[PDB]
Amino acid sequence: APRLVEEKDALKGGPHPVLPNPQPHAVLGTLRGQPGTETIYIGIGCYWGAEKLFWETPGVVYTSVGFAGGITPNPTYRETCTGRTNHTEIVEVVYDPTQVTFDELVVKAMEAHDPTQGYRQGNDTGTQYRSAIYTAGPNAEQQAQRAREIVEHYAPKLAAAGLGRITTEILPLASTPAGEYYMAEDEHQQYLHKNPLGYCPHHSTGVACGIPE
Numbered sequence: 001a002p003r004l005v006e007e008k009d010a011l012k013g014g015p016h017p018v019l020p021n022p023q024p025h026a027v028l029g030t031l032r033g034q035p036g037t038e039t040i041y042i043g044i045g046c047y048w049g050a051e052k053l054f055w056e057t058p059g060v061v062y063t064s065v066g067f068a069g070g071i072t073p074n075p076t077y078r079e080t081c082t083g084r085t086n087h088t089e090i091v092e093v094v095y096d097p098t099q100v101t102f103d104e105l106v107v108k109a110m111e112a113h114d115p116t117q118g119y120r121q122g123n124d125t126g127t128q129y130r131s132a133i134y135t136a137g138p139n140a141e142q143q144a145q146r147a148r149e150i151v152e153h154y155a156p157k158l159a160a161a162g163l164g165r166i167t168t169e170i171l172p173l174a175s176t177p178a179g180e181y182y183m184a185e186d187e188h189q190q191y192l193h194k195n196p197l198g199y200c201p202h203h204s205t206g207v208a209c210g211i212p213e
């Protein structure tokens with residue numbers, strides 16, 4: 001029921017980064033660009049929870065959250081939430097391939113969400129919550145093919161669970177319409193660490209003060 005907009009109808013965005021000077025990762029203490037690392041871009045729904053999942057993974061050396069897969073250049077969060085940018089909520093995962101592999105990170109993403117729900121994840125409805133893997137680096141198209149093989153290996157299992165087809169979008173980041181990843185505002189970066197009272201929406205509880213543990 002959500003739908004992508006025509007690119008001619010998408011928000012125009014802007015020419016300059018929304019977060020031109022990101023601060024070191026609140027947990028890992030790092031910035032992107034360490035020699036010897038690889039990058040994968042993961043969309044599995046609400047990026048706050050997704051970012052925490054990955055920065056806590058052994059071998060991941062930096063993460064950020066932001067937007068990719070759509071067309072609007074340098075969107076604000078508020079713009080992306082309108083659905084009119086076509087972007088999905090993405091975690092930039094920078095990792096040490098001698099400690100964790102591309103394959104392992106794809107599997108971790110697959111096992112962390114329902115990759116069959118289309119423009120939705122759980123109670124989060126919208127094209128910005130769709131499942132995605134965007135690849136990067138000199139072997140980006142080979143890595144995309146590799147992700148497709150892993151993802152396709154789950155298809156019979158998900159079919160047997162009564163869930164129908166996998167809807168995960170898989171392609172090189174450079175081959176998405178905007179061709180780039182855009183960081184979200186500083187407040188979103190490691191949001192759940194900075195604000196321990198915060199939590200991904202639709203996860204309140206019926207005990208204590210309603211904040212999930």
Ligand SMILES: C[As](C)(=O)[O-]
Binds near residue numbers: 045047089200201
């Ligand atoms: C990071 As959200 C509040 O769009 O799920």
